């Protein structure tokens, strides 16, 4: 019962976590450069709705994601 | 108990330089020929291919492809031994056994060797790891007598 989008986000976070320096900036930039409108919207909705099964790094990076029109 | 013997042989010749020839010698000495069921393991343990292991076996005459008879009779056919009448010995002997040159059987196997070092003793033969020289038309009698 994991949403594919949440899963991908948590994966990306688990990766970008072990890195040095800004860990959330790169995450947000990647999510912005790779994901589409509906997906970004869904993820933002997730992070705004406080859905469980999510990495706090993603919760922190969400505000920095490329805005959805 | 074929795989066992072969593995032992290959272990005995492990790490050598150009160990194919010795391994094949030992194999032939054990069984009596190079079985086609032993072209692969040798190749594997040596890092060769069945093809090369077969080519090597084919090129060389000392490696039998099938077994010989209970007895073997090699008979020089070179110049010196020819000089002092090897043809006559050959004829007498092949009439005695009834097997022409190269013609094998389950009883014996008459073949050529083309030298034994017994050049001074021109008529020379190898009967079952026993060399014989000065093979007149009388010695053949004893050759066949001890050789049923």
């Amino acid at each position: 019962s994991d949403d594919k989008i949440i899963r991908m986000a948590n994966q990306i976070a688990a990766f970008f976590a072990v890195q040095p320096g800004d860990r959330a900036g790169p995450v947000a930039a990647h999510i912005s450069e790779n994901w589409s409108a509906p997906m970004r919207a869904a993820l933002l909705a997730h992070v705004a709705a406080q859905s469980p099964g999510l990495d706090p790094l993603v919760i922190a990076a969400a505000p920095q994601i490329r805005p959805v029109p | 108990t074929d795989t066992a013997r072969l593995r032992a042989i290959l272990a005995a010749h492990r790490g050598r330089e150009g160990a194919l020839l010795p391994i094949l010698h030992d194999v032939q000495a054990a069984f009596g020929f190079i079985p086609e069921d032993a072209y692969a393991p040798i190749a594997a343990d040596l890092g060769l291919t069945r093809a090369e292991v077969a080519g090597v076996v084919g090129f060389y005459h000392d490696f039998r492809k099938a077994p010989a008879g209970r007895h073997v009779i090699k008979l020089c056919r070179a110049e010196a031994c020819q000089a002092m009448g090897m043809d006559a010995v050959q004829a007498r002997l092949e009439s005695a056994l009834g097997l022409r040159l190269g013609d094998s059987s389950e009883a014996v196997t008459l073949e050529a060797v083309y030298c034994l070092g017994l050049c001074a003793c021109a008529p020379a033969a190898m009967v079952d790891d026993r060399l014989v020289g000065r093979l007149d038309a009388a010695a053949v009698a004893g050759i066949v007598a001890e050789l049923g």
């Binding site: 594919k4 990766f15 890195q19 040095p20 997906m39 | 090369e52």
Partner: protein, 949 residues
């Protein structure tokens, strides 16, 4: 142009200082090692030769290349005679005429006079060298002959009956001239020693150690058939058909090695395909597929007319082009106006050219008005383009395949070049037999490890999934020790990041002694391998689908690049981090867009400076948002908000994971167009169908793994009447774009003008030079054979902290074993091209390489039927017990659709590029008779849906 192409020179070309010599009154200048024969060839003075070829080293068998040299006693052979300064040689004296006549006499005394009724008439090297010397009589009344079926008093014991076991070539020894150009080629070039000379002397006959070629260790490469002068080993297509007249240079539609072939043609009927001795990808060598498997183009199952359906449950309808395109465009515009432009999408094909790929990405971007495009790259080698982008800056290779000639070590992670890329494996073995060392990190014993006349070799037989732990351990070993190059780091890379990387990797938890528990590889062996890799002067990494296709692929690739940067194996011939690309033009497809986040040239889509240029060149407004990926596409279609799809040259059903889910997502799709040659697994859910064109009927280019741009020429004529780019522009104009392309030259010009790298690319260049590496601008006009030679592309390499995360595909009670999926040499990925050939001999059924100890407990035996009870499906397959794989590991193949293998595969994928996890799946292998509940339904659907009316 070079002579090595048109003319068969005598001996291989050597490197050395300039040596001057006089060949029959002609001054010549050639390297020192070069032989007399090759120099005479280069001088235009031809000397008769039959047993000497460029592919292999010379041997003194024929004795027909004899030449009188001043200062040398007798008539020495040119082939085995190295040139010396000031040497004056005489090619044709009377004595030599006489001697050559005599030798040809001795030949022909044992040869049948079947000339004029033999396959190789006009293409035989014995006939022209028998006429060249001027043989007019044979005085030897021969009684002992090999060809005579019946000798005096009865049968000839020497006569060996013909062998037609192999469906592609035949071996008639009656015509053999023992010269051994077959043996020499099979041993020196291909590297599989399957041919030998059985016997001593006149009795000597070529033979494999088996009854027939097929039963032997022959992989069907045709290097013996290419090097056999006297029709002994001959292609069957030359027996059925006459000897060909003209030649045309094309390339293979497989493997991404880009082996350059010349199709020998008799009118329009393709007689055969033989390598060209050109292209640095293959120097006159090939494999079964490209060499022989080209009969799919002449198959009856090929579809040649458009077909419209209007409902999958309804039958097809053979239809002309106009109304087909009309219906298609109508439905497309409807769906577009209803659900939006983002409700569409395309799936480009690597199999196709880069011109067609460009047209398709244009169709998806300019016409449709979306960024939803994709390709096969997304299931294979997408993580590569992320890792090597994050580290170096280029999402591509680093070296060519000639680099391997100068390597001193080869580290192979997740590759099987003996099957995947045979012609690369050949040139690898060429080196392995010459001292170079080898490390293999695959969990499964590959045939590259068991190569003959091998040097040293290490094999890290690990557990699938733990590929980054091993790399991390290698790094820990190299860093705890001090073997790495500090000068390289300080010059080409950064230090401040290197310090952090070292302080991280130097932790004693990522050490080889702790990973042995989870990885399964011994510690000492790993340390030894690491030390060997670090110590060697010029090492080279070759990686494939054992790193990319995993839950952590980009991470592994990054670790590998870190290794390659640390050690200093970059920016030089013999060293580099080479991904082994798959399909042809995967590189070219990825370069020409084929991705939902970029434009042609690996430029991001959000780049305003790029979008401007493209809106200016196409005169249309483009989007700045990145598009959906195939997984996303299918998940959407399942959820909705995705209705259309234009599948070009791809099988989204058989060649994709979770067959159930992808099928459910392909079904809920108001329109799914198909553009393949044959009726495919994907076309069972189609509403429309547009025929395609083979590489023989095409015209354009292919961008292979080593960034090489090979040129594809038209030999036949399109049987559907139109090539793929023609169909694509048809569709585009029918929708309203307004393109006018009459030749792909204009398209390539467009490409050049738009993106850089291809700015200097022109078909004339490709013809003259022959091949080009795509990084070719005004700077570096000739090309870029080697990347990062002078500093990296981004400017400074980047060391990234990689780590091992436990995969979610761990194994448990009801799924104890693991799973893997791979390939075979004979058959290609889905075998829609190859199953329709005679390559169903070597592989006609997919099987399961299970371990013996993991078979006894279950009751499995070789040849039994088993079921793979997985989590994401179920399937049945024929077993094969083998000690190749490790215990607790399994290996399947996906070439055949009768067995739905990808229904077992799970949806789990990489994090960055979402490349699926094909190489890990927790399964349960049990014994069963009934095939399956899924395979049955699939067969039923395919039967009820492939009916035409």
């Amino acid at each position: 142009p070079p002579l090595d192409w048109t003319q068969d020179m005598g001996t291989p070309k050597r490197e050395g200082a300039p040596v001057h010599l006089t060949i029959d009154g002609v001054e010549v200048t050639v390297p020192a090692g070069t032989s007399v024969l090759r120099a005479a060839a280069e001088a235009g003075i031809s000397i008769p030769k039959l047993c000497a070829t460029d592919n292999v080293e010379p041997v003194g068998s024929c004795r027909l290349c004899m030449v009188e040299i001043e200062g040398m006693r007798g008539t020495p052979t040119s082939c085995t005679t190295p040139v010396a300064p000031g040497m004056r040689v005489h090619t044709q004296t009377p004595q030599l005429q006489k001697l050559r006549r005599g030798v040809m006499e001795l030949y022909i005394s044992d040869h049948p006079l079947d000339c004029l009724t033999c396959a190789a008439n006009g293409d035989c090297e014995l006939q022209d060298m028998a006429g060249a010397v001027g043989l007019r009589e044979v005085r030897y009344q021969a009684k002992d002959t090999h060809f005579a079926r019946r000798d005096a008093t009865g049968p000839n014991p020497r006569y060996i009956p013909k062998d037609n076991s192999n469906p592609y070539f035949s071996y008639d020894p009656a015509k053999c001239i023992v010269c051994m150009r077959c043996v020499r080629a099979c041993e020196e070039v291909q590297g599989t020693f399957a041919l030998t000379v059985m016997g001593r002397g006149f009795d000597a006959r070529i033979s494999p150690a088996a009854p027939d070629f097929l039963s032997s260790d022959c992989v069907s490469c045709g290097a013996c058939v290419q090097a056999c002068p006297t029709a002994t080993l001959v292609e069957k297509s030359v027996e059925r058909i006459g000897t060909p007249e003209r030649k045309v240079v094309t390339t293979c539609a497989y493997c991404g090695v880009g082996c350059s072939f010349e199709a020998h043609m008799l009118g329009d009927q393709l007689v055969r395909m033989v390598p060209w001795k050109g292209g640095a990808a293959n120097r006159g060598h090939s494999c079964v597929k490209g060499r022989f498997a080209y009969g799919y183009a002449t198959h009856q199952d090929r579809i040649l007319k458009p077909m419209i359906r209007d409902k999958i449950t309804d039958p097809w309808r053979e239809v002309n082009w106009t109304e087909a395109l009309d219906f298609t465009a109508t439905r497309l515009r409807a769906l577009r106006d209803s659900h939006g432009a983002d409700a569409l999408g395309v799936i480009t094909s690597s199999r196709c050219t880069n011109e067609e790929t460009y047209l398709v990405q244009k169709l998806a971007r300019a016409v449709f008005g979306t960024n939803n495009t994709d390709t096969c790259a997304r299931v294979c080698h997408s993580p590569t383009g992320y890792g090597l982008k994050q580290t170096f800056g280029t999402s591509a290779g680093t070296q060519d395949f000639d680099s391997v000639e100068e390597t001193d070590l080869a580290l192979v992670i997740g590759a099987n070049p003996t099957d995947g890329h045979p012609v690369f494996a050949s040139r690898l073995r060429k080196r392995l037999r010459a001292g170079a060392k080898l490390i293999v990190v695959d969990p499964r014993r590959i045939d590259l490890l068991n190569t003959p006349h091998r040097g040293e070799a290490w094999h890290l037989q690990l557990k699938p999934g733990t590929n980054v732990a091993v790399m991390t351990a290698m790094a820990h070993v190299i860093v705890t020790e001090q073997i790495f190059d500090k000068r390289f780091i300080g010059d080409r890379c950064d230090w401040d990041e290197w310090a952090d990387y070292a302080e991280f990797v130097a932790n004693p938890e990522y050490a080889p002694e702790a990973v042995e528990s989870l990885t399964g590889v011994p510690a000492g062996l790993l340390r030894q391998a690491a030390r060997a890799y670090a110590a060697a002067p010029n090492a080279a990494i070759y990686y494939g689908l054992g790193v990319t296709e995993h839950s952590q692929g980009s991470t592994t690739v990054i670790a590998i690049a870190n290794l390659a940067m640390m050690t200093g194996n970059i920016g030089r011939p013999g060293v580099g981090v080479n991904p082994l690309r798959g399909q042809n033009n995967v590189q070219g497809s990825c370069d020409m867009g084929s991705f939902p986040h970029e434009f042609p040239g690996y430029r991001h889509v959000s780049d305003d400076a790029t979008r401007g240029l493209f809106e200016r060149t196409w005169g249309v407004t483009l989007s700045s948002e990145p598009g959906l990926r195939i997984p996303n596409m299918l998940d959407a279609a399942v959820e909705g908000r995705f209705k259309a799809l234009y599948v070009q040259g791809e099988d989204i059903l058989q060649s994709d994971p979770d067959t159930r889910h992808v099928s459910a997502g392909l079904a809920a799709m108001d329109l799914v167009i198909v553009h393949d040659l044959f009726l495919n697994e994907t076309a069972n859910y189609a509403h429309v169908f547009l025929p395609g064109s083979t590489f023989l009927e095409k015209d354009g280019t292919f961008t292979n793994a080593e960034r090489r741009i090979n040129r594809v020429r038209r030999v036949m004529a399109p049987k559907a009447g139109f090539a793929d780019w023609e169909v694509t522009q048809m569709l585009a104009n029918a929708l309203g774009a307004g393109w006018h392309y009459t030749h792909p030259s204009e398209i390539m010009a467009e490409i050049a003008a738009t993106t850089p790298g291809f700015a200097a690319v022109t078909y004339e260049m490709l013809d003259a030079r022959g091949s080009v590496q795509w990084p070719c601008n005004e700077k570096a006009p000739e090309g870029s054979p080697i990347m990062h030679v002078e500093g990296f592309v981004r400017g400074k390499g980047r060391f990234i902290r990689t780590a091992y995360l436990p995969t979610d595909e761990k194994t448990g009670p009801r799924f104890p074993l693991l799973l893997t999926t791979g390939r075979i040499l004979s058959q290609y990925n889905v075998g829609a091209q190859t199953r329709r050939t005679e390559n169903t001999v070597w592989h006609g059924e997919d099987r399961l390489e299970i371990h013996p100890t993991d078979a006894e407990t279950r009751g499995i035996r070789d040849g039994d039927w088993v079921r793979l009870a997985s989590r994401a499906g179920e399937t049945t397959l024929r077993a094969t017990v083998t000690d190749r794989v490790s215990p607790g590991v399994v290996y399947t193949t996906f070439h055949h659709p009768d067995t739905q293998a990808n229904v077992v595969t799970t949806d789990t994928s990489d994090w960055a590029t979402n490349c699926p996890e094909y190489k890990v799946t927790a399964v349960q292998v049990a014994a069963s008779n009934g095939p399956s509940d899924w395979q049955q339904d699939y067969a039923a659907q395919a039967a009820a849906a492939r009916r035409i009316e």
